[PDB]
From a paper:
[name]-N335 crystals grown in KNa-tartrate solution diffracted to the highest resolution. Subsequently, the three resolved SeMet-[name]-N335 domains were used as search models for molecular replacement with diffraction data from the wild-type protein crystals grown in KNa-tartrate. The resulting electron density map enabled tracing of the XD3 domains. [name]-N335 associates into an elongated trimer, ~ 115 Å in length and ~ 65 Å at its widest region. A monomeric subunit comprises four domains; AD, XD1, XD2 and XD3. The XD2 and XD3 domains share the same threefold symmetry axis as the AD and XD1 domains such that three XD2 domains splay apart and do not interact with one another whereas the three XD3 domains pack together around the threefold symmetry axis. The separated XD2 modules lack continuous surface for binding a trimeric partner TSP, which is unlikely to represent the physiological structure. In contrast, the three [name] -N335 XD3 modules pack closely, with the adjacent N- and C-termini placed within a face perpendicular to the threefold symmetry axis. Consequently, the opposing face provides an uninterrupted trimeric surface where a partner TSP trimer can bind. The third linker connects the [name] XD2 and XD3 domains by a glycine-rich flexible long polypeptide (Thr250-Pro-Ile-Gln-Leu-Gly-Asn-Gly-Gly-Gly-Ser-Gly-Ser-Ser-Thr264) that is structurally disordered as manifested by the lack of associated interpretable electron density maps for both the wild-type and SeMet [name]-N335 crystal structures.
Bacteriophage (phage) vB_EcoM_[name], discovered by Kutter and colleagues, is a member of the recently defined Kuttervirus genus of contractile tailed phages belonging to the Ackermannviridae family. Each TSP recognizes a different lipopolysaccharide on the membrane of a different bacterial host. The 335 N-terminal residues of [name] promote the assembly of the TSP complex and anchor it to the tail baseplate.
Author numbering:
A (entry chain A), B (entry chain A), C (entry chain A): 4 to 256, 265 to 335
């Protein structure tokens, strides 16, 4: 019956043994000095409770019933400073303190390998309003599209999480998040030759960011009306000016000028080029008129049905879905 | 004196031994192939540094001095896709990518067992504005109440954390969070028989969500004035219409019409049904009047003290605590 | 050649052995009852895959290639209730459910030791609007300054993360975050002797919080115009009143009165004491005028260039960069 030697009081050992494994039935304790290790291993095969150190990935993984290998007790963020570079590849599980004090920069998300793959960035210096961070999903999509995205709010922090290839990276956690920007086209470029109050574009744009010598200008500092950008204050000669059309991406949770403030007169219909959500009120020559009293507005048609005929040389201003 | 056999150069072993434990005083190393395991165990008793694999819970726990058993190096999020179901039980420590593309859905929070028990959800498809997610604390309260809560902002992500039974689940982490809704009553139900510009309610409601064929309508598309909801645009015949009273729950960080725009005349007192926070201004027939100049308003009394007598057939509009 | 005793079928042991380590080449398994331990150790020296229990820190650390010792599978949050105290030291890696139901309180961030050191707080009771939480970076700076910060939004949750000493603690994760306050000066103190509609300050302040018997008053309840605070409603005699100047700190993502509503007449220039971002419109005696039609405004100069001479006894109100 007995398969192997039996040591009823156990055994002491005074140098390192070389043991091909054991089923243990008692307490594994340690003494001062006792160092202890996990085996190196990069393989998919495993059994629940098996634990390892991954030398490739530098992560202590255990092998969980459903989903095999994974980091021990879920995961957590590995913070590091990021040298300001024009471009930087990030790794799953890290967090990057970004310093855009010097200018804009780009980070490139890693190839996703698992649902829940995560990368955290942070405007540690509060500089993204003026020097946006561009985030690149490489060829995989971000919010259902492969378009790069820029974060133009300073002090914003954000965890990107892989939802799978259909919607791709989505932000699961963050602070400070306003409108993401998806820049479509650099629709104006110019080394300004004189002091510049305004510039005219080749096309009326939807909505634009403006960049002076690679520094994003705040929306308070310029105004886009039709196809002219006006600059308050002006910009000096020699300035590297860029205008960039973009599509907003909403994370967190409007005035119309008719005929340059000139009233055609005896008209009941105003048509707004943009289909508008709502028109609560219209200011006429410093007098406010309210919807379903002074006027009727049809949303699909974008047509304001005026109650009475206009006079000649009146000033008309429209409020569009404002602080409802 | 010697208690057991001594092996001064250690021992080699060529098959698995069967060892009832040992105090180890040297380096436990491994060779290629070396697999290593933690013991299975679901018990409360433990000693600091004891480590285990929990087979019930599928989590690698260590036993920490204060609070015994816990996940190794705190925790972290276990992401998984969630099949769109009308209802779904979630587990502590998981995160759920939700797909509400097809319609609304409900998730039910687990029984809490420990302070800091956490569950993460995510509108991965940006669909909660139109197909809200309802979150259920089962019988335990959420923000101090056992009422279910709905998230109607798309692209929102949110970690719910157990604070104990008094306040219950609270969101500790998230992105996109606007107003939670706590639906009190389905105050109107109807299969519409004609095209519908408006509907009258059995009661004037405080604030309402509207649902057409189980899809939540945006606040831009309808207006609730007194006890009539008006619809811009209209809704087709056959539509499954629902109106739902709810109480907001504020996470992140207003016009009054008097006598249907008809002035009674020679009056100095306007009373606002809702007690109002503040009344900066009143528009009278397209002329704005400012508080503590044109008028005096008392907040508890909700009474606007007009400086001069009203004329007959004037239009009066009040601004209530607007963009201060 | 043979260095030590060879046991070709392994060995059984019936009591605890005392082994000075081994290179293991096979499966370490366990039986029911098998308890297993990591060695205690608080030292910087280590080799990749070495694992330990830290008795000082109560954390199960592994030794990662780059950065040696660290919590196993990154980290995660250790939630605990916080006894309401006037002041409380927090520990790295914990999260604190705060109860400010009873009144304001202060938490003090720990000495940072590693980039990514993190502490989470949470207004579990939704009480910070009325009883702000003050956060102290001790002598280290927070957002580049050593000034304490107060959170006055209820239901806010927030993780503070060490970015290194230059910018110091930054919030990397959170919910509900509005304007941080950095209180500079208690610029008014008084036990009120009568019912109080208003109080006059020794200095015109920029922006102020107000506290009645240690409870922060909501901005709806009082108004600061020039150097007079007006109170709507009033405050009872015996009230412990405090006014506090502060500088906002923006995380998430305006009316000017000229000569007390009295028009000097025949003037084209209005100068605004604060340099203003933008002035879209000016209300004159209940008539709105729009920028670049009715008027021209220069931002650096803060000068409104009126088109026509003022009349005597007119009312002028200015809109400053409002809901653009």
């Amino acid at each position: 019956k007995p398969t192997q030697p039996l040591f009823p009081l156990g055994l002491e050992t005074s140098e390192s043994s070389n043991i091909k494994g054991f089923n243990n039935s008692g307490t594994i304790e340690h003494s001062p000095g006792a160092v202890m290790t996990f085996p190196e291993d990069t393989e998919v095969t495993g059994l629940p409770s098996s634990v390892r150190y991954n030398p490739d990935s530098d992560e202590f993984e255990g092998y969980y019933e459903n989903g095999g290998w994974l980091s021990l007790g879920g995961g957590g963020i590995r913070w590091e400073t990021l040298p300001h570079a024009p471009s930087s590849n990030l790794l799953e599980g890290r967090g990057y303190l970004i310093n855009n004090t010097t200018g804009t920069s780009t980070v490139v998300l890693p190839s996703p390998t698992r649902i829940g793959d995560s990368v955290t960035i942070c405007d540690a210096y509060g500089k993204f309003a003026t020097y946006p961070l561009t985030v690149s999903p490489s060829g995989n999509n971000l919010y259902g599209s492969t378009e790069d995205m820029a974060i133009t709010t300073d002090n914003v922090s954000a965890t990107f999480t892989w939802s799978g290839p259909e919607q791709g990276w989505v932000i699961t956690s963050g602070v400070g998040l306003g409108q993401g920007r998806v820049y479509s086209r650099e629709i104006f470029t110019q080394i300004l030759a004189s002091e510049t109050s305004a510039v005219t574009l080749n096309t009326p744009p939807t909505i634009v960011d403006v960049y002076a010598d690679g520094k994003r200008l705040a929306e308070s500092k310029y105004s886009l009306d039709g196809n002219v950008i006006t600059f308050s204050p002006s910009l000096p000669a020699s300035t590297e000016l860029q205008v960039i059309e973009y599509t907003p991406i909403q994370l967190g949770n409007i005035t119309w000028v008719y005929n340059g403030g000139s009233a055609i007169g005896g008209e009941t219909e105003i048509t707004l080029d943009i289909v508008v959500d709502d028109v609560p009120a219209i200011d006429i020559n410093g007098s406010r008129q309210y919807k379903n009293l002074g006027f009727t507005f049809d949303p699909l048609t974008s047509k304001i049905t005026l109650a009475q005929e206009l006079d000649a040389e009146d000033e008309v201003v429209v409020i569009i879905n404002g602080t409802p």
